[PDB]
Design a binder for this molecule. Structure first.
Ligand SMILES: [Mg+2]
Length: 251
């Protein structure tokens, strides 16, 4: 239930530990316009350091930032990590999605086709990869071991900015251009719209195993949350956010 946020406008990553209402600032260094964040159950944090065309990670309680050995990134927009430690990145400026398997020294390009300005990525424990294909107003997926993408049956998306998936295969998307969050359950082809209100250019979404949903409400400099079944959003007690770009939660 810990929440991490890329506080883009302030070139920093903040967190609110489970049970705390006072954020901490993580000791990343030299970030610029950081665009997204991913975490694992060990509390390692990965960040797309967008303005520096790189991906960095920080282990829990450390003072060591590691630059991951990706190649040729341009304006990278989002990151996802699985329990095996593979890292996926939406390489926005190159219209592609790349990954580093844990322990690999060079990235792989995923066999998506026709992407434009991809904005975000999520993975599940089966290794399925979902991408917000922002420039085409759609969400695409590759199943583990497949090289044939499919397009999810969302409707009416505009400049979608981020995606999250749970262990049941439900998919949530920040439909940025429409100021809303939409979801599709696994066996569903009819989206619902979550009861957030007053969102402005929402930038990212995270879910936990209990079905709580957190959203970086970028245009209002805040993070909002709906617990599973809730109909009233809660503004988290972060302070000083500016143009926040992404959010990740752990269990
Ligand atoms: Mg973004």
């Amino acid at each position: 239930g810990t929440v991490w946020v890329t506080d883009h406008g302030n070139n920093r990553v903040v967190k609110l530990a489970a049970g705390s209402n006072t954020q901490t600032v993580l000791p990343f260094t030299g970030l610029n316009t950081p665009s997204g964040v991913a975490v694992d159950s060990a509390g390692t944090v990965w960040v797309t350091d967008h303005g520096n065309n790189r991906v960095v990670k920080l282990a829990a309680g450390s003072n060591t930032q590691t630059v991951l050995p990706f190649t040729g990134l341009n304006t990278p927009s989002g990151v996802a990590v699985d329990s095996a430690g593979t890292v996926w990145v939406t390489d926005h400026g190159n219209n592609r999605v790349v990954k580093l398997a844990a322990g690999s020294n060079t990235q792989t390009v995923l066999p998506f086709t026709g992407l434009n300005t991809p904005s975000g990525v999520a993975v599940d424990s089966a290794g399925t990869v979902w991408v917000t294909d922002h420039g085409n107003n759609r969400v695409v997926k590759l199943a583990a071991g497949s090289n044939t993408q499919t397009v999810l049956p969302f409707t009416g998306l505009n400049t979608p900015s981020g995606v999250a998936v749970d262990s049941a295969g439900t998919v949530w998307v920040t439909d940025h251009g429409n100021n809303r969050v939409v979801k599709l359950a696994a066996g569903s082809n009819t989206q619902t719209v979550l009861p957030f209100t007053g969102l402005n250019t929402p930038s990212g979404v995270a879910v936990d195993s209990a079905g709580t949903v957190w959203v970086t409400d970028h245009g209002n400099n805040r993070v909002v949350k709906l617990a599973a079944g809730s109909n009233t959003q809660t503004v988290l007690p972060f302070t000083g956010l500016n143009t926040p770009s992404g959010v990740a939660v752990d269990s």
